[PDB]
Structure 1
Amino acid sequence: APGTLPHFIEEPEDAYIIKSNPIALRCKARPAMQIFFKCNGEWVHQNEHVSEESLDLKVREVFINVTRQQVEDFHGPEDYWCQCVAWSHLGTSKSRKASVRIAYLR
């Protein structure tokens, strides 16, 4: 009090690519002035982010597209993950790490 750090209304959920169709990672936080995705320790490019700002304090909603080509090119130790970082005047707030793996239908 009086200020508050960004509280996530919607956190990124674990998604699956079926088949070669791109997935969208939903993220919503309040109060937030900037919201950016951090996939596998590296910051995602600003042009890949689709922002949607509204007033209720400032509410921000950001969506990112993760294709099959992006996941297959990554050959790390664990599964392909994406985390949401929201900015405010007092600081930052990190959401849960959402995993994205390529699936195959029966």
Structure 2
Amino acid sequence: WVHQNEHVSEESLDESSGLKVREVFINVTRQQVEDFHGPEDYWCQCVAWSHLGTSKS
């Protein structure tokens, strides 16, 4: 998981249907990638919360 402070949330409303939309942005620096010494390429995934469950991107 990425720290809460790194996340920048946006509380938006859609035109097609009157429902709560959420948009989150996270900055990734060169220093983060070049200092990462894992087996695979520096990857990221998105997890969203609802009253029924969760979904991965």
Normalising by the residue count of structure 1, what TM-score does the alignment of the two structures yield?
Answer: 0.47
Moved over 3 A (4+): none
Deviation at 1:72, TM superposition (A): 1.0
After superposition, the C-alpha distances for 1:56-105 in whole angstroms (9 at most, x for unaligned) are: 321000000000000111100110000011110000010xxxxxxxxxxx
Deviation at 1:54, TM superposition (A): 1.5
Question: What's the counterpart of residue 4 of structure 1?
Answer: none
Deviation at 1:46, TM superposition (A): 0.5
2 CA distance for matches of 1:87 and 1:60? Answer: 10
2 CA distance for matches of 1:86 and 1:70? Answer: 24
Compare the two structures and name the one with the higher strand fraction: 1
Q: Secondary structure at 2:31's aligned position in 1?
A: helix
Compare the two structures and name the one with the higher helix fraction: 2
Q: Secondary structure at 2:47's aligned position in 1?
A: strand
Deviation at 1:51, TM superposition (A): 0.4
For structure 1, the residue ranges without an aligned partner over 5 or more in a row are: 1-42, 95-106
Question: What's the counterpart of residue 91 of structure 1?
Answer: 53
Deviation at 1:55, TM superposition (A): 2.3
Greater RCO, CA 8 A, separation 6+: 1
Aligned residues: 52
For structure 2, the residue ranges without an aligned partner over 5 or more in a row are: none
Aligned-residue CA RMSD (Å): 0.8
Q: Secondary structure at 1:47's aligned position in 2?
A: helix
1 CA distance for matches of 2:35 and 2:26? Answer: 18
Normalising by the residue count of structure 2, what TM-score does the alignment of the two structures yield?
Answer: 0.85
